[PDB]
Amino acid sequence: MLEQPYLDLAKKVLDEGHFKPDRTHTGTYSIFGHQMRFDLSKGFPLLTTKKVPFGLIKSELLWFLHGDTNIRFLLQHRNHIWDEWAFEKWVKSDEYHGPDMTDFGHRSQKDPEFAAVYHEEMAKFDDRVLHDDAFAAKYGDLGLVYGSQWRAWHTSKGDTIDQLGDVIEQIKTHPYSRKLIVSAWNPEDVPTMALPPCHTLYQFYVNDGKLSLQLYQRSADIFLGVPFNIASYALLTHLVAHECGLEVGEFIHTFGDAHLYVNHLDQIKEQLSRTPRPAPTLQLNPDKHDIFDFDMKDIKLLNYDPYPAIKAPVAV
Amino acid sequence: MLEQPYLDLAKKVLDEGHFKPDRTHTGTYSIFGHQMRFDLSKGFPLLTTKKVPFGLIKSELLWFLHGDTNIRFLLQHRNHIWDEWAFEKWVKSDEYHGPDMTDFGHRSQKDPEFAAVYHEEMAKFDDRVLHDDAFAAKYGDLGLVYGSQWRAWHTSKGDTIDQLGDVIEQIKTHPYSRKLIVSAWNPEDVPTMALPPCHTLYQFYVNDGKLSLQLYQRSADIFLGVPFNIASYALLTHLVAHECGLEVGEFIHTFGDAHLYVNHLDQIKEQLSRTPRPAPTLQLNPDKHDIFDFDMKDIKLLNYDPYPAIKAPVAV
Q1: Theoretical Cys-Cys bridge with A59: which of A77, B33, B109, B292, CB 3.0 to 4.6 Å?
Q2: A205: number of CA atoms within 13 Å, CB side?
Q3: Is B198 designated active site?
Q4: Domains by residue range for chain B, with CATH
């Protein structure tokens, strides 16, 4: 089955993982250096042994493809994955006067009535960005995040580079280039970013009228993140192949520090009892090829029939 | 045996390689996405089934560690690996008046008396850089090459970043960082560089008082380059571990487009008939730890006993 490499990664970390100190409290078992590939001709690698919400990844990747960096687009899609990063910077403003918060989430793990009030403040935040323009502009924009990295790399000479746009054109004119890379890792920016890119850089490859892509990930949460991570870069592949009137091939996922938090052990043991079901199939609007001008309904997932979702504390 | 992964890579490319068009004339058999690791506690991975000149890699890596980008240091060490890159730019000067050359090497493959005269011009070049200061300065400096990438990344704000210096300090203060990366791939610079870095970026990892490093290589010549590539990043590991008073672990070598030119088939078939010998051992000056102020004699290779070198046309 298509998703086995994931199940194999989970097993592997559970046996060969060494205990490691995490910037959290919740320890991890980790490994370093690992590679797993997914023959995309055999189906779309969306975990079947666990329910993973495509809509969220579908919207986030369009957020990326649009060169977008503002939370409004995601909130305008019920995607709250990036809410904490932007919110954070907001509760660190003079405009902010309400109840204090010091590194929440973690501080919401030992959940008191506080977390609920925090829920009202996120509510109050999101809505602000959602209906007021100027607000959305100062706290809604995250800036140096994947959307700007991929398509708005900032030069020293003041301009802005469209890595992804250039490489897609490159694939089209010189499909046999070993220089088809787009990095999200900017040295000048990495030292002061709350979250330096987990997905450091990727490479395309045209084998036989077939596109393939390898992703190099510096850190990874086996349980929580990888399931999303796989679908995201397998989808990118599909979109680039689409625009490039090219067939699809293989998706290689390379890792630096792949880890599984201790507080996810029972959760991953269980998801491992399940046997995989046949994997879903993707569809992209045939009458549309500009993956940048792409919209939500142009991407359709078929036959996704997964086992229930596993509830686990979000990495701590 | 320690070097088997290499022999396995060679076999693999020879069976699973697909024919591909190369920016040359000499076609290649390639593969995409591959990982091989070398337990450095088991010996230094310098190919034994083929004689590979350590001195050259030893000097080149110090050239890198010194933040150096001038050919003089290498010529001052009989290292002529970077000679064509700098020479090239020289025969494209108004100061240059001698015999014409249009993409030599290749143009020297169909070798006429010309190649010999070309030999006299390289001679004439090298010596210029070797004894005259101002010359060395305009054509001897290559600029955007590994030495400046690793330790002199140029910001938009006009300054310069020492990636390697910062990460070594980082390893020392926070050895469990998943952010221990040094990239050599600068988007702003990649589109006009004759040779964008083949070694795109690397990551360190402290497991158990043990340093490990993974290298992500976008393109690779199985026969010619990888043998050098392995020793270089296995040595870096040893040097960083050294300064960091840390033990050594594993060296992972990840590849994007690993290929073997057609004109190396008989050469690699043959090197494959040989069985590996016990691998050599490294030694670094104990009474010295500043891997940046390191000198040639501070690195000693022991018990290197290889089979003869295999003569093969340099990638075309």
Answers
A1: A77
A2: 25
A3: yes
A4: 1-316 (3.30.572.10)
Determined by which method?
Answer: X-ray
The span from the CA of A180 to the CA of A163, in Å, is 10
Chain B residue with minimum CA distance to A29: B207
Note whether B31 and B281 are within 8 A (CB): no
Q: Name the active-site residue from B52, B81, B130, B198.
A: B198
Write out the two tokens for B153. 């990344």
**Closest partner CB to B18 (pick from A156, A207, A256):** A207
Give catalytic residues of A, as residue numbers. Answer: 198
| Residues A214, B256: C-beta atoms closer than 8 Å | yes
- Provide the 3-class DSSP secondary structure of residue A117: helix
Of A34, A188, A207, the CB nearest to B32: A207
**CB-CB neighbors (< 8 A) of A203 in chain B:** 218, 256
Q: Which 8-state DSSP code applies to residue A213?
A: E
Please state the separation of Cα A134 from the chain's center in Å.
27
Residues B205, A158: C-beta atoms closer than 8 Å: no
For residues A237 and B62, what is the distance between their CA atoms, to the nearest angstrom? 39
Closest-CA distance, A197 to chain B, in angstroms, reads: 9
Chain A neighbors of B216, CB-CB under 8 A? 201, 216, 254
Interface test with A, best of B162, B204, B213, B214 (most A CBs within 10 A): B214
Q: DSSP per residue over chain B, as a string? A: -TTHHHHHHHHHHHHH-EEE--SSSS-EEEEEEEEEEEEGGG-----SSS---HHHHHHHHHHHHTT--BHHHHHTTT--TTHHHHHHHHTTSSS--SS--SSTTGGGTS--HHHHHHHHHHHHHHHHHHH-HHHIIIIIB--SSHHHHHH-EE-TTS-EE-HHHHHHHHHHH-TT-TT-EEE---TTTGGG-SS--SEEEEEEEESSSEEEEEEEEEEEETTTTHHHHHHHHHHHHHHHHHHTT-EEEEEEEEEEEEEEEGGGHHHHHHHTTSPPPPPPEEEE-TT---TTS--GGGEEEE---PPPPPP--S--
Resolution in A, one decimal?
2.8
If you ran DSSP here, which 8-state letter would residue A49 be given? S
Query: What letter represents residue A122's amino acid?
Result: M
- Residues in chain A with CB shorter than 8 Å from the CB of B203 are 218, 256
Place of tokens 């829920």: A119
**C-alpha to C-alpha distances, B200 to A124, B119, B195, B196, B261, nearest whole angstrom:** 44, 32, 11, 8, 21
What does the alpha-carbon distance between residue B46 and residue B61 come to, in Å, rounded to a whole number? 15
Structure-token match 């369009």, residue found: A62
Report whether A83 contacts A122 (CB < 8 A).
yes
For residues B227 and B6, the answer to whether their CB atoms sit within 8 Å is yes
Q: How far apart are CA A155 and CA A158, in angstroms?
A: 5
